[model samples]
Target chain A: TGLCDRFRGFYPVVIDVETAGFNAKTDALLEIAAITLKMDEQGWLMPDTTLHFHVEPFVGANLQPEALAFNGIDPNDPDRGAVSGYEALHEIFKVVRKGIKASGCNRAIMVAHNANFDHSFMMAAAERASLKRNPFHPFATFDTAALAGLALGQTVLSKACQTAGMDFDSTQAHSALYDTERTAVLFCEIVNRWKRLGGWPLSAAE
Target chain B: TGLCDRFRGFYPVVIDVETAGFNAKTDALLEIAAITLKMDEQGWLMPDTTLHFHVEPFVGANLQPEALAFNGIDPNDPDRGAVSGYEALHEIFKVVRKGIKASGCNRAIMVAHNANFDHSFMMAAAERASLKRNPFHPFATFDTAALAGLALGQTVLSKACQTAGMDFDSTQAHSALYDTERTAVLFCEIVNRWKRLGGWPLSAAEE
Candidate 1:
């Protein structure tokens, strides 16, 4: 059986977004990144390609100073080459569409540390941009924190990763691309361990 | 000094909603019920008057037959005494405002079995009704399911109540008032047991 077949024909895509504030409705999305996983001929699941975007804050967006300090983003720096929210969403959707097609799955499910926070922000941003072709499932998400909680009795992303014997760079903690990459690794490890432990059915026939 | 005083001066108000369906954005709110608790002079928390309402589905609201069947509500039955969504929200807020004031706290926090689900529907309905003066905190919700998971090692409401030795009438399971009343009892029992077990600091002086 293929990797996607094990997950009910849905492939996991790790998504992370750095936002201006906590409120999904009013906050500005600063950065977005995703890494989609695929299975090789040997039935090993691996991340194939990464997508990253630096997003311009929507007009009248709430840019909290504390959030900026935490994220370490200088939105005013023109040299950063940030694209408009619509343009960034378009590019992200293009990658997501290709990832779903390449994985031979009906839909891609988003995987994140705090899945609701990321999914809510992604949905709100899509609504604002009026983008209709989002490739991820509307309400379905795979939360690494939940998995970590079950596996190691921890919920915080960095702490959970540490307990799971994974490397997590503190300096690159909040960067969307870095966080997404680590989340991808965590997801794969959990799935593989579960499969080996006989927690999941070995084949589609089973 | 008091039980309510230990929880950051916030009182627990158990709220439950019966919706047209699970989607808070698109579904219609069918019923709402809330019962607020108060600590007497002896530091005993007791539930005050209960508030209940049957809300009329908003114009252009989606009323799923499956949800209506599960909730046992017939919106078209004229004898059901359903009021407009705006009126229902107004009445609900008035009681919540009084609860916050009677508790002598700056805010009253919502307590529900699955709090996020109830809170989401309430917020969406309130936004649609355009009513202000929401007394509950935006994100501060006390989930009874979490409390049950910790206290009785159960998650489902009926199973948790059974483990706690509390009465749960399956026949009245979906009724908003009945569920809210049982939830209020569950919350009080857990808090009292926790206090007696020395799980919580007895006084505000600990902080």
Candidate 2:
């Protein structure tokens, strides 16, 4: 009744990804982290738990040095204990499916700062893995860029968080866990902020 | 300055597709249409023109009977003058690119009711065509479902339109032209409604 009602029947899961290149269809997903959310008695949304992973690049995946350099990921580091993208995504979707079942939400809608980047990568990964059951909603997502731009007037992740008065660490950025955690916070704040505005304006027209 | 500034230099193009099946990666794009928007002197957005095409199925596409029945398409109908998905897509992007240049926007963003469905198919088609200049924004889109749910408290395309007090003709619903046109209207209404509320609430804070 709580979280599901907040966003139709779709559960909101904040996702952040670090990849080897810009193309989802061609790049390697180096790192991914997802945070499932919950709604409290006050009707405020907050992060529940994060499922984080370091993924081995797909065989023959394009590992663009520029992208790897930007995210500071060493794909060949064995100490990272990276699993294959297939293993990581299968396990992640398993967690997502359970969260969806537990919350009575039919499907998970991706929540990300830019939205599409992470969404495309996840969808592409699932296609690659050929996972039978995809927990995330097919094509729809809750993009913080669109949400923040609409509600906060800023589109950049760092600026939107700062615009909302949240502390953002530049040094800790880019890591999937840090970015997903921050996106979760930013998303929670936007929902709470909208509630404080007396709820969606059109909802009241009823 | 008006339209381009409104959306962070993204030229918002409304798109809708009637397909042969559900999976974007596997299906055939049977019918497709796109409507590019323009801003008026009064700062309102409306459809500029529609580029419509009836696309032939890809050489080895999956055409499910269920999807064909739902969309009411006769894939083999000669009178329809359908072009191959590749030819149609390349031409569509050609027009989209000109609009992108004409408006001074760097990239075009896909706008649709359930944006991902149409967006994925377009991306898949572009990949199939090997179109080097894919004009659409890589991953980001202006999904009207999220926009309507946030602004109108409704998520269904038909319900959102009715909620906005717009007349929706379900009789003409499944066609790409009609659906895209209706979605464009709903999107325009929501943006205009937000503007009337004194612009984005946080933008005024101006940190």
Candidate 3:
């Protein structure tokens, strides 16, 4: 079986996090979202469930002014119902575990554009929160940027989505949940194309 | 204390690996070398000891012809005394653990040129071997390319070393141990210049 087929038995969770800055150490995780994929018997994937959290800035966390302005998140806005870092992580882990159980997969792999950035921030935040039981694999990630580059010859998320004929709204860009949903659709589109091309397994006849 | 000083408490090991190809998953790790740095009482780094290993290609591993030609490694030669991938990683972990203990550090950080490439290969090999106790941090790496770009306006290892007045021999360029040693010297030179300029903590006053 090819690597893609090997991934067929594993649940893929699309994740995106809006952070206060580029530095994972001192920066704050502003918002997080994940959309889990469910595969049918034919190896087609569909977005099953989604989880999102708005996180309050961690104590002593540096909220970069430019980053806040760019992401359009106000940590102090009482109307947004921001939760503590630990609480936010707890909710995320809960959803990830539920997704893994429902999918009957050993583990859920994270999918994201520029996955290393999201994975690094997620790991750093998980470490700080001291919450265990994270269902996602530590290092394995399905990077849509790489997939888009391979299949559609594009790297930007919106551009790749547009190239794939998926709906992409610029007004909703940078919102954690919206990016997560779009990325999920993009991943499915790429994988479905592979399936159609009989590229599920290298040994499979086209 | 600065990030560099924080790193001093943790052992910094310069590592280089000559691989059969760029893809870490299926490619074989042909050779590996490490040079651990020791700090003197004045906080200056000195090369403590070195470890080198020639790893036998894993069964079913892909040895790309282009990569083999570039690295000039004859895997079939019995004279090279290559150990198994598991054995090579065992020795590497032992030396890294010893360095960490000797330095009284919690962990060891890896330094390399284009660190992500080397780090990725090393991690994938370790996972394949299933030998834990990897002393290097998962994601933290000191890339001499970035250092050279900051200090000497060069990114290529040999050119960076040459711009910094270090000797570079073309004959020994692709050897893992030789590259490790040159990268070690480059790291020391960059950090030492920063020390002389009082650039520690990245906010210190230049005196």
Candidate 4:
């Protein structure tokens, strides 16, 4: 029998936001995105779980000049397309909702590295979409960085990995899928170690 | 006899920044501006000084889609005649510099209600100008709001004025000139009162 008793086989969606700047009211969401699902069965991510999009900015939300440079956003990029604030949120909601349904997991929790920042943008976008109130509400899932910080007493993911004797992969830092996959590994490690060390018997929360 | 023995004229140039958004670095300056000179004479502000300009954003400094409504800046307005960033900074620098020259004050300590935010835009604009780096460099100035808070024990400017038994003029609060003028009066009264009470004396090293 495996040392871990029950496997939830849950579908957890990971989200990220690329914003014009920091002002919640004034900054536009340059991108509202999510990776389909993150799961590790036998130390491997289930195939087919990644997504990215360039949602156009909302009118009147000025992009902070510095944000553009850091993100390397080119307004003139041909691939950059206009998707209204409503459309972007609606599309993400559909994808996540459908992904949850397809993954056939009765319990699904949204996961983001810095969940609050992503959630704030989502909440605002949901309000704009006039969609059902926060699909992730009340579930109050996990933040990988928070978990990694607690596990190793360090808040940064890279630092946490270093502490755990994992090689620091600089290549996987900011991409939507790469970061989600990296975080998935960290989440699994933390849960397993915590369970072994007499932490609560962990399973996916509904 | 003057109630306050050591009185010096202090000129604070009021400034405002309109960027694309919160990100400081990537956002080009949509507007970088200052009001002429708000000064303290015998510890009372004579009148407010004012400066205003809309800077043309650089080519790569694309306007964000969301910022369309706040200031209602029409990109076409520059084509209609708003000054270039270079010109706006030049005019602003010239006006303030001239005031400093005329007053025999080598450089007037720059004051803004929110000095740090204005200073960021000013520093950026100055860097763009290829001028002597921020004429008022090394002399980061004071915030009238902070001084008002210290004086009146509240951060509210109008409340500070009222508590001091001063009239609070609401006109042009957002406009660089009007706000600067309003703040200048507040500065003069506060500095004067502090002087009479034998409070901190103005020091060159003090901003």
Please tell me which predicted candidate would have the highest TM-score against the true structure: 2
Tens digits of per-residue lDDT, candidate 4, A88-149, equal 66776677666656655443345556455565676776666678744454323345544443
**How accurate locally, in lDDT, is each candidate?**
0.75, 0.83, 0.76, 0.55
For candidate 2, what is the lDDT? 0.83
Name the Cα RMSD for model 2. Answer: 3.9
lDDT of 3 at B128: 91
Please tell me how candidate 1 rates in CAPRI terms.
Answer: incorrect
Candidate 4 — which residues are off by over 4 angstroms?
A1-206, B1-11, B36-49, B62-68, B78-81, B156-174, B196-207
List the pairs of residues colliding in candidate 1.
none
In model 1, how large is the Cα lDDT of residue A5?
A: 61
Shift of residue A81 alpha carbon in model 1, Å: 2.8
lDDT of 2 by residue, A36-130 (tens): 89888766778887889999999879999899889899999989989988898888888888888988889888888777788889999989988
Reported per model, the fraction of native interface contacts reproduced equals 0.00, 0.23, 0.00, 0.00
i-RMS, each model, one decimal: 11.4, 2.7, 19.2, 23.2
Candidate 2 Cα deviation (angstroms), residue A5: 1.4
lDDT of 3 by residue, B142-177 (tens): 667644543554557888799788999999988999
Q: Which has the better DockQ: candidate 1, or candidate 2?
A: 2
Q: What is the lDDT of residue A73 in candidate 4?
A: 65
- Report clashes for each candidate as comma-separated counts: 0, 0, 1, 20
CAPRI tier of model 3: incorrect
The DockQ leader among the candidates is: 2
Candidates arranged by DockQ, highest first: 2, 1, 3, 4
Off by over 4 Å in 2: A21-28, A56-66, A81-103, A114-117, A120-134, A152-156, A159-168, A198-206, B22-27, B58-62, B81-102, B124-134, B199-207
Tens digits of per-residue lDDT, candidate 4, B51-119, equal 667677766676776764555566665363567777888777778777666655445455555454566
- Worst 10-residue lDDT window, candidate 2 chain B: B198-207
**Local accuracy of candidate 1 as per-residue lDDT tens digits, B1-207:** 453464555666789999999888899999999887876675555688698889899888898999999989999999999998788778877887876676666776677886767888888888898887777766556667645543443456887688778888999998998999988988777666544443333232254
